[PDB]
Design a binder for this molecule. Structure first.
Ligand SMILES: COc1cccc(-c2cccc(C(=O)O)c2)c1
Length: 242
């Protein structure tokens, strides 16, 4: 079942922005959101696509393991952390597009398309350039569709090896303390309107897991921090985290 909680709209209209948060209680199998319509509106996945992209690269052998080094191609880009060597862990952490563009080129159109259908990922449409379709191509995914994909990953139910899924979930590690663990991936879509930010993942507790998927309008990069801050405010309000 689902439940709409418009009280959460304050967290967006307090920072003069608009967006949706979708929560899923795995134990109770119940969903919650501030906006049922936007929860089912499909956007470019942008860097959240590095989750499925990593899974495919690992399962096809394009990426041997999370230690394999992908050397900087020597082209200076405006993101300083991109102008250096990376492995899967750091490429995820710093959302290093050029590393994942190379993954996609080595994956190829046919295998990429085959895998996204097996994953039931979004509209499963890779139309556009194989090395940028998740930034300015035809692929689209909604917040509720992100949840369904993430739940499969959590339970090792995606049609790739258990090893591939374990490695990606390691690479998704974002925060951990004595109270909770967050595995998640940010996204920032700018090439097609509306410009949005993503944060998708889940919160591990001692005895339950809460999946989440949020997106919000992002007219400029100044508000990127609100992706995590708004999500955590919702989690705090629902007393999912202290
Ligand atoms: C043109 O590329 C841009 C433009 C503006 C920002 C980024 C960027 C890079 C790394 C992390 C993140 C992030 O979501 O925190 C954002 C990339």
């Amino acid at each position: 079942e689902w439940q709409e909680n418009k009280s959460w709209n304050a967290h967006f209209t307090e920072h003069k922005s608009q967006g949706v948060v979708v929560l899923w209680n795995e134990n109770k199998q119940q969903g919650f959101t501030n906006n049922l319509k936007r929860a089912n509106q499909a956007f470019l996945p942008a860097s959240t696509f590095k989750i499925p992209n990593s899974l495919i690269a690992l399962d096809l052998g394009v990426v041997k393991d999370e230690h394999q080094v992908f050397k900087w191609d020597g082209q200076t880009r405006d993101i300083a952390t991109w102008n250096r060597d990376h492995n899967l862990i750091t490429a995820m952490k710093y959302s290093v597009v050029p590393v994942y563009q190379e993954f996609a080129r080595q994956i190829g159109e046919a295998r990429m398309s085959k895998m996204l259908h097996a994953f039931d990922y979004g509209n499963e449409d890779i139309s556009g350039n194989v090395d940028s379709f998740w930034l300015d191509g035809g692929i689209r995914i909604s917040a509720t569709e992100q949840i369904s994909f993430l739940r499969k990953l959590y339970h090792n139910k995606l049609h790739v090896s258990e090893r591939s899924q374990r490695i990606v979930k390691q690479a998704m590690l974002t925060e951990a303390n004595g109270d909770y663990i967050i595995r998640a991936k940010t996204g920032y879509s700018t090439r097609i309107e509306p410009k949005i930010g993503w944060w998708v993942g889940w919160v591990e507790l001692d005895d339950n897991v809460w999946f989440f998927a949020m997106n919000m309008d992002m007219p400029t990069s100044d508000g990127l921090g609100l992706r995590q801050a708004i999500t955590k405010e919702v989690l705090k309000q629902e007393k999912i985290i202290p």
